[PDB]
Amino acid sequence: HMKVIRDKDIKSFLNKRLTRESIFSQFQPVLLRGLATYAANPNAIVPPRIVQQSNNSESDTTHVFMPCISPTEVGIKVISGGPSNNTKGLGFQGCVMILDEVTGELNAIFNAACLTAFRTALASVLGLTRVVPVDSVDVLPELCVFGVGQQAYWHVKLTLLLYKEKIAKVNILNRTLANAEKLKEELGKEFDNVEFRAFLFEEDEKFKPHMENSSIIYGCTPSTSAVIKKDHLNKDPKYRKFISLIGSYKPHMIELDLELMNDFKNNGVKVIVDSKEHTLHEAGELIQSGYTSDQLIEIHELYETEEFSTITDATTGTTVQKIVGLSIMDLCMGKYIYENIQDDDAVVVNDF
């Protein structure tokens, strides 16, 4: 009665059902509803998470247990990472457990890797598609993603499906050139009509023109020093710039120039966040600048209004979105996939 959906199976389901329309009509609505559902009864749906460092002498992994009990999506996400897993290349490893919302029976076990990357990319586009519609005329023709891996992949993939006619060049930036070139190839083979280039953080002058010709910038890095520099971004107010930052999850992690973060604060710009509580306790871009909850707006709240001059720096046309991750994202998207994935893309277990 349970289904084990592996990382490959998730990517299969997504690749088979992810289109511009599907994102707008199926995926995004579920995530928006989950984010709104969570915001209504936050402490009852996502109880305080349990974080425990490994009690094994041969491991530096920290295990975090994040339960989610929504009216419709019930379960638990357990993710684990740290130096050893990072150095070994495994990174954050774990799974998402989906339960019956009425009985509590085990219905699905997902691999958290792909699921986390997809829900994070769907959250980034949930705000991007709201502030910069795909019919907008103020979009520069290039996209720059700082980072590699599943996070950068799904961010690029989803954005290329949404802004197909407007994005012609994708620039992948990373600390090491190996994994960046690996992503450039995989994305190049998948999207033939898009030119994919890979740069190193030191190849400034070489990517700086591309960064100044970019309207969508993605932060998918575990950086402790800002990789997106204010002087590398377009400063023309006629063109809109939407920066979705997802990499930082600790106060010492930051991706966007702290001067720009302070400039946005002093200029009265509200930053888009997934959760004001978590971002002001986990996002170094906000923690190191002294941002307050009143100068923040949550993604679901962007769909409750149409006035967005509060989230835009009028001197440059720049908008900042910071995502830290929420278990409702994993549970609402995992429940959706579980109820629509075919047995060809799932390990169905009978008599569990």
Chain positions contacting Na ion, by CB under 5 A: 39, 294
Residue 252 binding result from Na ion, a second copy, Mg ion, none, given CB thresholds of 5 to 8 Å by partner type: a second copy
Q: Among 47, 141, 188, 237, which residue interacts with a second copy (rule: CB under 8 A)?
A: 47
- Do 118 and 184 meet the contact criterion of CB atoms below 8 Å apart? no
Touching Mg ion, residues 325-344 (CB under 5 A):
335-336
Tokens for 40, please give them.
């209504």
342 binds, among Na ion, a second copy, Mg ion, none (CB under 5 to 8 A by kind): none
Specify the residue, 212 or 257, whose C-beta has the smaller distance to Na ion: 212
Residues in binding contact with Mg ion, number by CB under 5 A: 3
Report the 10 Å Cβ neighbour count for 54: 14
The answer to whether residues 106 and 2 touch, using CB atoms and an 8 Å cutoff, is yes
In sign, the C-alpha dihedral spanning 212, 216, 221, 223 is: positive
| CA dihedral (4, 49, 279, 273) positive or negative | positive
The interface with a second copy within residues 140-169 (CB under 8 A) comprises: none
Which of 19, 25, 72, 340 contacts a second copy by CB under 8 A? 72
Q: Segment contacting a second copy (CB under 8 A): 71-79, 183-191, 239-247, 320-328?
A: 71-79
Tell me the residue type at 87: T
Q: Report the helix count and the strand count for the chain, using DSSP H and E.
A: 13, 15
Q: Which of 19, 25, 87, 105 binds a second copy (CB under 8 A)?
A: 105
Conformation bin of residue 237: beta by default, left when phi > 0, alpha when psi is -120 to 50: alpha
CB of 78 to Na ion, least distance (A): 23
Quick one: which of 281, 305, 339, 342 contacts a second copy (CB under 8 A)? 281
Residue found under tokens 């996002």: 283
Identify which of 156, 323, 329 has the alpha carbon closest to the alpha carbon of residue 247. 323
Q: How many residues bind a second copy (CB under 8 A)?
A: 73
Q: Which stretch binds a second copy (CB under 8 A): 72-80, 164-172, 194-202, 295-303?
A: 72-80
Based on the shown chain and the rule CB under 8 A, indicate whether residue 326 belongs to the binding site for a second copy: no
State which of residues 85, 136, 179, 295 lies at the interface with a second copy (CB under 8 A): 85
Give the nearer residue to a second copy in terms of CB position, either 81 or 147. 81
Distance CA 257, CA 243 (A): 12
**Nearer of residues 83 and 209 to a second copy, judged by Cβ:** 83
Binding mask 29-58 for Mg ion (x = CB under 5 A): ----------x-------------------
Q: How far is the CB of 335 from Mg ion (least distance, A)?
A: 5
Among 168, 252, 268, 305, binds a second copy (CB under 8 A): 252
Q: What end-to-end distance do the CA atoms of the chain give, in Å?
A: 6
Contact partner, 310, from a second copy, Mg ion, Na ion, none, Cβ < 5-8 Å per class: none
| CA distance linking residue 20 with residue 161, whole number of Å | 5
- The minimum distance between CB 125 and a second copy, in angstroms, equals 27
Q: How many CB atoms lie within 10 A of CB 59?
A: 15
**Considering beta carbons, is residue 36 or 76 the nearer one to Na ion?**
36
Binding segment toward a second copy, per CB under 8 A, in 171-179, 236-244, 278-286, 325-333: 278-286
Q: What is the CA radius of gyration of the chain?
A: 19
Single residue of 20, 33, 63, 169 touching a second copy by CB under 8 A: 63
- 310-315, long-range: CB < 8 A, 24+ apart: 310/268, 310/269, 310/270, 311/131, 311/269, 311/270, 311/271, 311/272, 312/131, 312/240, 312/269, 313/263, 313/264, 313/267, 313/269, 314/237, 314/267, 315/235, 315/237, 315/267
List contacts with Mg ion (CB under 5 A). Answer: 39, 335-336
